């Protein structure tokens, strides 16, 4: 392993929000692929089922558009249409409480799903442990 094991409680049951508290943005999936982050609550975009793959690997899926989050080969996130090898990530917790999300393709460079405080995507190689804009906080929908 590259990274720690520390799961988070809950579960999979329920679709949620993905609420990223260095902005306070919700992160979205727009019907063409964008990916983002938004402050609107009221967007339909922004509902994600996550299920597992194997022990503390998912799949982050738009509930509204059927897209998987991913990040490709230069860090930048987008909505796949296919379950691919971009589109798997190690779910894990963080500071006792936040919920991280690593991509699993990239793992051993510590490329996480993150937002800036402005709302917008942070680039894999941008990101990295002790970050705020890592920390993620599900909600229910």
Known sequence: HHHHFNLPPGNYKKP????????????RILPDG????????????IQFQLSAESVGEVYIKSTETGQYLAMDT????????????????LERLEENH???????KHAEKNWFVGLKKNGSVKR?????YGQKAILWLPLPV
Request: net charge negative; proline share 4%; aromatic share 12%.
């Open 124 to 128: 894999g190689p941008r990101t990295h």
């Open 98 to 104: 936040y919920n991280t999300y690593i991509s699993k």
């Open 16 to 27: 949620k929000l993905l609420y990223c508290s260095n902005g306070g943005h919700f992160l």
């Open 74 to 89: 230069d860090g930048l996130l987008y909505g796949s249409q296919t379950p691919n090898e971009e589109t798997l990530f």
């Open 34 to 45: 964008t990916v983002d982050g938004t402050r609107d609550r009221s967007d339909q975009h």
